[PDB]
C-alpha cells in the first residue's frame, strides 16, 4: 500500500484549474517522481468522476516510450494521487516560448514521436483529445513524454464516436465546435496545431475572446510563411483540414496516412519507437531537483467508504 507520508514534497511543477503537480522524492528508494494531486470534493461537484477514472485507467494500462508511465495511483480521505515518471525537460511550451520557432527538422523529430504515441493510443482504442504544448513534455534525454490523460476516452475503435464538448479552446477541432458527435480525427487536428506552432511560431487561429476564436477555427483559412517548405505546408494543410473526412489521418487507416506523408519520408518508424534517433536538444539538468525548464510562476510558489473512487490503488510491476 502507498500513502502520502512515503514522499518528500519539494516544489510545484505545474497547476491547472482542477489540480496541481508537485515534484516528489520517494523516501524508501530516493527516486524522483511527479505527483498529480486532485481534490475529490471539486471532482464530485463538477460531475467529473468518469473522466478521472478514465485518466487512471489510461495511465495504468498504457506502455509506450513516449507516454508518461505511472508508478503508483492511490487515494486518501480527500485527495486523488498519480505518481508519474518525472519529465525533467519541462513542457514543449517552455522551449517554444523561449526559442520563438523551431527548425523543420526539430519539429519533425517531436512530431514523429507524437505520431508514434497517438498511433499506439488509437490502437488501444483511446482518443487523447487534449494535444497541446503544455501537455507535451521532454524527458531527461530530450524525448517526448505525453502527459495529462484527463480528457481521454476509452473504447473508441475504428469509426466510433464521442459526444463530450471538451478540450482546450485554441486547440479545438471544427467538428467539436459543431453539434452532435465526432471521431478520432480530432487528435490529428491537435497534432496539426502543435506542428504549426513549432514551425510557424504562432497558433493558426487566435483571439483572447473564445467566441471570436471559435469563429476563426470554423471559418478562417490558414496562412503559411512563404519560406516554409512545400512538404511542411502540405503536412499542415492536411492536418488542419476543417472536414475530418478530408483530414490527413481522418481516413480509415488513421495514423498510416500521417506516417506516409512526404514530410516524414526520412523517418524510420521502428527507429522512432525504439529510441534510436538522436535528440536535437538534451535538457541540461545538473540534478534531479533542477527545475530550470519549468516556469518560475510555479516553482517559486510555497507548498503547504462512500467517497471511495473505483479502479484506483495501483502499483507498477516494472
Amino acid at each position: 500500500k502507498v500513502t502520502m507520508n512515503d514522499f518528500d514534497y519539494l516544489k510545484l511543477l505545474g497547476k491547472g484549474t482542477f489540480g496541481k503537480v508537485i515534484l516528489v522524492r520517494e523516501k524508501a528508494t530516493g527516486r524522483y517522481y511527479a505527483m498529480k494531486i486532485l481534490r475529490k470534493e471539486v471532482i464530485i461537484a463538477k460531475d467529473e468522476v468518469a473522466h478521472t477514472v478514465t485518466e487512471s485507467r489510461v495511465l495504468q494500462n498504457t506502455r509506450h516510450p513516449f507516454l508518461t508511465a505511472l508508478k503508483y495511483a492511490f487515494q486518501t480521505h480527500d485527495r486523488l494521487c498519480f505518481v508519474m515518471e518525472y519529465a525533467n525537460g519541462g513542457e514543449l511550451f517552455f522551449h517554444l516560448s523561449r526559442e520563438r520557432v523551431f527548425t523543420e527538422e526539430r519539429a519533425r523529430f517531436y512530431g514523429a514521436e507524437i505520431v508514434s504515441a497517438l498511433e499506439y493510443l488509437h490502437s488501444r482504442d483511446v482518443v487523447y483529445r487534449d494535444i497541446k504544448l503544455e501537455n507535451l513534455m521532454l524527458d531527461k534525454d530530450g524525448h517526448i513524454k505525453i502527459t495529462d490523460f484527463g480528457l481521454c476516452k476509452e473504447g473508441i475503435s475504428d469509426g466510433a464516436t464521442m459526444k463530450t464538448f471538451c478540450g482546450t479552446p485554441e486547440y479545438l477541432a471544427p467538428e467539436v465546435l459543431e453539434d452532435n458527435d465526432y471521431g478520432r480525427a480530432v487528435d490529428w487536428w491537435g497534432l496539426g496545431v502543435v506542428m504549426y506552432e513549432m514551425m510557424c511560431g504562432r497558433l493558426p487561429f487566435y483571439n483572447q475572446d473564445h467566441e471570436r476564436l471559435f469563429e476563426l477555427i470554423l471559418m478562417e483559412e490558414i496562412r503559411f510563411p512563404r519560406t516554409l517548405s512545400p512538404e511542411a505546408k502540405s503536412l499542415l494543410a492536411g492536418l488542419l483540414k476543417k472536414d475530418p473526412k478530408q483530414r490527413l489521418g481522418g481516413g480509415p487507416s488513421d495514423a498510416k496516412e500521417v506516417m506516409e506523408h512526404r514530410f516524414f519520408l526520412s523517418i524510420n518508424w521502428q527507429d522512432v519507437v525504439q529510441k534510436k534517433l538522436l535528440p536535437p536538444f538534451k535538457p541540461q539538468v545538473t540534478s534531479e531537483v533542477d527545475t530550470r525548464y519549468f516556469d518560475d510562476e510555479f516553482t517559486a510558489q510555497s507548498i503547504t467508504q462512500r467517497t471511495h473512487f473505483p479502479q484506483f490503488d495501483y502499483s507498477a510491476s516494472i
Binding site: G16, T17, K46, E48, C166, G167, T168, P169
Partner: peptide, 10 residues
Amino acid sequence: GRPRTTSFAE
C-alpha cells in the same frame, strides 16, 4: 506571445 491555455469539459 500566446498565454497559458487550460482545458474545459461541459
